[PDB]
Amino acid sequence: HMVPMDKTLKEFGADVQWDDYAQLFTLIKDGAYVKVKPGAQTAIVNGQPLALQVPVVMKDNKAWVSDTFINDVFQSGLDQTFQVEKRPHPLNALTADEIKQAVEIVKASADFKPNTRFTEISLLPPDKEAVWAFALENKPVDQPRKADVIMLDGKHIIEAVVDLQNNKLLSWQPIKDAHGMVLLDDFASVQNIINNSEEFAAAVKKRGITDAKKVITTPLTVGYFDGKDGLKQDARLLKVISYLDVGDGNYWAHPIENLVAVVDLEQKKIVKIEEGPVVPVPMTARPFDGRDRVAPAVKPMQIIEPEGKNYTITGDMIHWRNWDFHLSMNSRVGPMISTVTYNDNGTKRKVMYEGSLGGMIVPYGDPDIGWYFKAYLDSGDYGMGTLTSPIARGKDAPSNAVLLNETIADYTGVPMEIPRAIAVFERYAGPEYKHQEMGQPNVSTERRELVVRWISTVGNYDYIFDWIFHENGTIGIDAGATGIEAVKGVKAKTMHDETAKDDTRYGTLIDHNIVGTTHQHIYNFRLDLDVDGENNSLVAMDPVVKPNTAGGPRTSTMQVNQYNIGNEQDAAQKFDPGTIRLLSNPNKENRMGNPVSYQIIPYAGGTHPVAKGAQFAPDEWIYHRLSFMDKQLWVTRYHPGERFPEGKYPNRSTHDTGLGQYSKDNESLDNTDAVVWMTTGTTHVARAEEWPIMPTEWVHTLLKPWNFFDETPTLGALKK
Amino acid sequence: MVPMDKTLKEFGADVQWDDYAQLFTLIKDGAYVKVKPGAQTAIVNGQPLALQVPVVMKDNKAWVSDTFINDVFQSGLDQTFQVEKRPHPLNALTADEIKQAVEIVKASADFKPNTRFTEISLLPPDKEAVWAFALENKPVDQPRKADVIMLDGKHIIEAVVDLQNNKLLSWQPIKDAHGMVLLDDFASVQNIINNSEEFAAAVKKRGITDAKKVITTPLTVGYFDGKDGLKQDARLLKVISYLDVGDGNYWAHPIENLVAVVDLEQKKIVKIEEGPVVPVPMTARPFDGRDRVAPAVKPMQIIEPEGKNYTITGDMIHWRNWDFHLSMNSRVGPMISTVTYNDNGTKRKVMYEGSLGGMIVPYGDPDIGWYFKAYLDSGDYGMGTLTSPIARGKDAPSNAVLLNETIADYTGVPMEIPRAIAVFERYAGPEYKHQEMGQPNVSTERRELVVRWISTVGNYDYIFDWIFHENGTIGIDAGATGIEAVKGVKAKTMHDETAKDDTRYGTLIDHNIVGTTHQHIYNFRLDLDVDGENNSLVAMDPVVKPNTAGGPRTSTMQVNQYNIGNEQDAAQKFDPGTIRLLSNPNKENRMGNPVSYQIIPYAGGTHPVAKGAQFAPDEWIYHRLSFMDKQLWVTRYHPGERFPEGKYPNRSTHDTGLGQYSKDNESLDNTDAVVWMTTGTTHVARAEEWPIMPTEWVHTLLKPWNFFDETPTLGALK
Numbered sequence A: 001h002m003v004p005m006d007k008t009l010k011e012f013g014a015d016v017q018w019d020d021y022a023q024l025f026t027l028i029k030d031g032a033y034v035k036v037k038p039g040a041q042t043a044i045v046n047g048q049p050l051a052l053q054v055p056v057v058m059k060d061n062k063a064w065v066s067d068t069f070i071n072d073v074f075q076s077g078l079d080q081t082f083q084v085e086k087r088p089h090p091l092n093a094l095t096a097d098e099i100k101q102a103v104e105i106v107k108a109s110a111d112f113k114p115n116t117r118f119t120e121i122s123l124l125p126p127d128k129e130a131v132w133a134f135a136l137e138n139k140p141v142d143q144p145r146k147a148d149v150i151m152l153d154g155k156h157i158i159e160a161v162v163d164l165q166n167n168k169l170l171s172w173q174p175i176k177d178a179h180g181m182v183l184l185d186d187f188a189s190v191q192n193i194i195n196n197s198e199e200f201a202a203a204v205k206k207r208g209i210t211d212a213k214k215v216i217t218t219p220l221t222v223g224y225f226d227g228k229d230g231l232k233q234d235a236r237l238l239k240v241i242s243y244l245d246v247g248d249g250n251y252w253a254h255p256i257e258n259l260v261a262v263v264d265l266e267q268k269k270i271v272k273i274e275e276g277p278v279v280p281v282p283m284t285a286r287p288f289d290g291r292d293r294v295a296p297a298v299k300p301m302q303i304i305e306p307e308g309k310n311y312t313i314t315g316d317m318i319h320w321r322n323w324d325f326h327l328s329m330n331s332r333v334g335p336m337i338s339t340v341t342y343n344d345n346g347t348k349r350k351v352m353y354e355g356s357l358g359g360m361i362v363p364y365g366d367p368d369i370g371w372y373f374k375a376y377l378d379s380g381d382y383g384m385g386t387l388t389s390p391i392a393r394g395k396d397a398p399s400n401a402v403l404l405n406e407t408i409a410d411y412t413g414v415p416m417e418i419p420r421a422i423a424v425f426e427r428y429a430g431p432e433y434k435h436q437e438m439g440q441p442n443v444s445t446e447r448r449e450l451v452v453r454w455i456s457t458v459g460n461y462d463y464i465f466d467w468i469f470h471e472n473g474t475i476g477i478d479a480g481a482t483g484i485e486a487v488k489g490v491k492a493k494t495m496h497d498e499t500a501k502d503d504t505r506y507g508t509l510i511d512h513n514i515v516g517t518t519h520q521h522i523y524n525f526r527l528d529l530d531v532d533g534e535n536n537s538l539v540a541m542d543p544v545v546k547p548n549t550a551g552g553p554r555t556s557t558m559q560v561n562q563y564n565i566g567n568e569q570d571a572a573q574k575f576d577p578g579t580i581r582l583l584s585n586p587n588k589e590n591r592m593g594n595p596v597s598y599q600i601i602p603y604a605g606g607t608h609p610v611a612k613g614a615q616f617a618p619d620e621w622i623y624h625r626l627s628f629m630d631k632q633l634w635v636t637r638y639h640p641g642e643r644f645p646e647g648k649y650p651n652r653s654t655h656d657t658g659l660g661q662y663s664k665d666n667e668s669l670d671n672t673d674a675v676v677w678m679t680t681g682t683t684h685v686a687r688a689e690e691w692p693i694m695p696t697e698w699v700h701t702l703l704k705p706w707n708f709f710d711e712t713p714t715l716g717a718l719k720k
Numbered sequence B: 001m002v003p004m005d006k007t008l009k010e011f012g013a014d015v016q017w018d019d020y021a022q023l024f025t026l027i028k029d030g031a032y033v034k035v036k037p038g039a040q041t042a043i044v045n046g047q048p049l050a051l052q053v054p055v056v057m058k059d060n061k062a063w064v065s066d067t068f069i070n071d072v073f074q075s076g077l078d079q080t081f082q083v084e085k086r087p088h089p090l091n092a093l094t095a096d097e098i099k100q101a102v103e104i105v106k107a108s109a110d111f112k113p114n115t116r117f118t119e120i121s122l123l124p125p126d127k128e129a130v131w132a133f134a135l136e137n138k139p140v141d142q143p144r145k146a147d148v149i150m151l152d153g154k155h156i157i158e159a160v161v162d163l164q165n166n167k168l169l170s171w172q173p174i175k176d177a178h179g180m181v182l183l184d185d186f187a188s189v190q191n192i193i194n195n196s197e198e199f200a201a202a203v204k205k206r207g208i209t210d211a212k213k214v215i216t217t218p219l220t221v222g223y224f225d226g227k228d229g230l231k232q233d234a235r236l237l238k239v240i241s242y243l244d245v246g247d248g249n250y251w252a253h254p255i256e257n258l259v260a261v262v263d264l265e266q267k268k269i270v271k272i273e274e275g276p277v278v279p280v281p282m283t284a285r286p287f288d289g290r291d292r293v294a295p296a297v298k299p300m301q302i303i304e305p306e307g308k309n310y311t312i313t314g315d316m317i318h319w320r321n322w323d324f325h326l327s328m329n330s331r332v333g334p335m336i337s338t339v340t341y342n343d344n345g346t347k348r349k350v351m352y353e354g355s356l357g358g359m360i361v362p363y364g365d366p367d368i369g370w371y372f373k374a375y376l377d378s379g380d381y382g383m384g385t386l387t388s389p390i391a392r393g394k395d396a397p398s399n400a401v402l403l404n405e406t407i408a409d410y411t412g413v414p415m416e417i418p419r420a421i422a423v424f425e426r427y428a429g430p431e432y433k434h435q436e437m438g439q440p441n442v443s444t445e446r447r448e449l450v451v452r453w454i455s456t457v458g459n460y461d462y463i464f465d466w467i468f469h470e471n472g473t474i475g476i477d478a479g480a481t482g483i484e485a486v487k488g489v490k491a492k493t494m495h496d497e498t499a500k501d502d503t504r505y506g507t508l509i510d511h512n513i514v515g516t517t518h519q520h521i522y523n524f525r526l527d528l529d530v531d532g533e534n535n536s537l538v539a540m541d542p543v544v545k546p547n548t549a550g551g552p553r554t555s556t557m558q559v560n561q562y563n564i565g566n567e568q569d570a571a572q573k574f575d576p577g578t579i580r581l582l583s584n585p586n587k588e589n590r591m592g593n594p595v596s597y598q599i600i601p602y603a604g605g606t607h608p609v610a611k612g613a614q615f616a617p618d619e620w621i622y623h624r625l626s627f628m629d630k631q632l633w634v635t636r637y638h639p640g641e642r643f644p645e646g647k648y649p650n651r652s653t654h655d656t657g658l659g660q661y662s663k664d665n666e667s668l669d670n671t672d673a674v675v676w677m678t679t680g681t682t683h684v685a686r687a688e689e690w691p692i693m694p695t696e697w698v699h700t701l702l703k704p705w706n707f708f709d710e711t712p713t714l715g716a717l718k
Ligand SMILES: O=CCc1ccccc1
Pocket: A218, A219, A220, A221, A376, A378, A458, A459, A460, A461
């Protein structure tokens, strides 16, 4: 029997186009570009003929296909985008089975507990040297597949290491004073605790809310205030900010200002309720999904690759032109780009052993009760990999993208597959280079970039990360921000109202009774670059104007002050976009005798004002606990255990256990394995254009090869 | 009948044949056509067309009617271009007007025999009348006039003509003004050097066996109060030379320390400066791929089968909520005029006129052949005139529409530049997005309309994109590629004796070749009229202040707001961490905030940023060009102030540009303002940029700030 084509293909996730003039169906799904005519015996897949056992049947204007059409066509093999990995890469993320295995091992230990949850179950990284040997020399990693299992027993953190190869527990170490990150069930717990709170229902009622059932809560971390917040450091707590559900699908637009409940998770009870002046709840419906809007007619635009892609995905490894890298997923920081090499006329040269988001922070600047503690560490306290948002095909990524699925473990230790977790796509990016010599034939070549996009949503914010591999050796990393703003309810409707001045002291009035509290977005990227080898050095090149001492009319000249940065303490600094910073390899030079290097650019621009550092007086705790905020560039000695800027356990941390710690010993950075950390952010002062929903804003970072090659990288293969 | 592939490709259309569907897909600009052999109809942008003569296959070769192209492409089904019945007042001079203007000044008794024309452009009606035409369809009741700037030998004469009444209005000689470099000067220079016995000897001394292989370059000499020993009243050019070795890239073969000074009216070398002899780098370094083989790539196409979202009526472009006028000028190139944003039915003013103001590429080497090198590409050479035709699908995406533009050449003859400007829409990631936990996702794609122009002056190639976002934001990016000006040096690697001295002012990017450090400084003139003519300049500086509200916090994030009332104060460095708005104090949005536009002179770049001019304040180039040292300028609207580097910058003795326009320090309070953005880079070379440099970009932005009352792209309410 057969099934309706349109319905079935849509369900499948393929785009369906019917051309009445050509009596032709064009079907697109990732790397597959298919063409099929009703009644035809063969179809075309990426330019290649495919015999069909059952042709497409057109009945009374409706097409029907065999129940095998989707598999015969899309899994034919004519789409070579994906190839089966023969020799499993050592950096492959834990499979579902491995996840379940690690969980059975710890549950087999005499100490496991029933309520024991899992904050992170991830692969334990083999030694860097063995992995490179595999990627480069194809030498097998004879070290056992291990996995880190970080558990949360109530409010206590426990670190366990399991041996997957030999199915045995290798270690079980409790971590005192450490708090665990926020977990999914805590969200449900908070809303439930508030719904059962007699006092809170009372507090809410005195603030104009009749039906307390329509109150939506939000789980926020409290941070650390040396006790000034009057909060017991020992307890596992969360503060709660509420909004009113008006039925417009956007509760963020209806804040219940000056009301904050403090919830103790293990005690499952409200341990405190801070109240401030009663402010009428903004009631006007402000939907952002278009329900109240007119759909504008727009002409279609498709980016197509009818013969397939230029990249191939073997297991988790991606090959594209001269690039080769491994892409995996982590529940905390998200995507991880590993063993990145560039094929230089036959020789795979090392570039980056491991790169990924390091961590990020979004601190607000309002002193009031519902804002003073608000300083989010999204990846660290919430797990952005876990909160990945499936890519909306054709919208969140261009129509010529390939969408990958990724698997991680949820908090209960059960394997979780995230559909459309990461997007891969090549894109036209203007001319690679060009020169129109007067009176001569023109010379131009197009530029192509391979983009790896991942989106994670934590509450009201939606973050987008792109890892851009330029064909010419350059690597870009941009961060985009969109979503819904965290607003403050105020009495003023316009700037003409008596309270306007005070209501807008910490933010712009972007709507009637609504203020967009100023805050910042600070991202940090951990880049373990191995510029053509592990032993590198950090070099600085400051362009300067010096007095002319060679004669002639000129009084000055443009020269450069070049010097090495021998230690971590000095490598941790502000970035002047007017200067040049390089991670060179003092052991290898190019054809001209210059050390092969990569230029590090933490700030290549952005669409919001740039954050010159953390907008905090040097005496604020947040500024103290987290030092990665005030420096745009950091360089440390390679250590497999140092991966987070804010520290491994930032939830209510008392001191800096991250970059401040990784560099406190001020170690030598001369000709050794270095790790670059780039910090970049924006200072967000709101405007009406960003409400009810914010247009995507971007920040750009860059890694350019500096004398890494001997000439224009894209000139082409030498003919003679 | 006639051959299809042959005919269609002569037409410039792309032909594709799908044997499986027995279908031809024809593409050219806004036309996307589909036609099957033997079919009685065809499809043009989604619409059915009846054919007089079906396409016929003859020996596997398609054949079509001799009227096919016209019947199909000029059918009317391609709505990209529309007829302009009422000519916009800012339309550039037409070929007929260019010829009329030249006839008028030639009919004057003062017109001398070999006069050349530096510029023949439209003398624009008053701003008010123009805005009235775009907003109210009110006719501009003023005759079309044209400015005709002439160069009589070395003398500049400014004249004004009345095109509607065909009469000469004024004829004014300009004292002490030097004219820009004209194309024929390029040839004079090469020819003068060739006939120079002295030069040939000078060259022989340096190792060149055949002087006929010496390639010259016409370089402006600047001004040095005489310290360079050059007469101020003489029209001069310095000549740097290269050796043509047959690799199609003479730039890779510098003849270092040899500089000739040429007097254009006397037509001879009036001074030769010789320095240390350096052997000419000989190794072949072609950049055209003659010695290379490109890797095979799977095809990629960007298609709009139903046509474009934009309409081009004459020179007026309509796209979504945007409406603007695009014209061409021989000096600065593309001009974006009468820009409005259609806010739910009402067209609101955004920008009266915007265009490249001017630019400069100054070098940092003190030596004999570099110290005077400070190029004002548009001002001294005419970037519009030197526009480089866009290479379809390469310099611009495959879904672009290529426009032809017309300007006058130096002899006053109309000149049509093919594919002078590219217009294309592009996907720019999600416009906005929110994936609420456990709810249906909300995403919309972003679309930008890019207007791209490429100009090439000598070795450098410059790209300019005017980017219109659906949400009201306007972006302006400048890209740079081409061939680097290099210095000949003795060192082959950094291990040689002279290596350190050879690389004191630049990187050693190849054997015996150093890419001399320099800067790329662009300036944009933006006559913004934020929802009206009368505006003010407001500064908003984010600052950290002590907490006075109580609670654990010791500090807060606040904004320091204040108006900048005059021109001198408006001329300032730009801190990308601050906010600068051009507000309209007379209009507010629904929340009581002044409708405004955020000015961002520096939104990023792929090369190191130029925080100012890499020159001591006592350098002459520094004195002559103040715009290099400040990223933001705001002055009162004046029709005659259009160039940051001044109107006649060749060998100028003082600042006649932005330095002069702001000198008076006038009031910028609630009045017609003009914004000037200066953005630049400091370029320290590397091997990856030789023999040809990969395109490098810089970005600027203009964002609506409380101009609207909400997300501009949500759409109209049902
Ligand atoms: O994203 C930061 C913390 C948060 C989590 C869930 C809802 C709102 C805010």
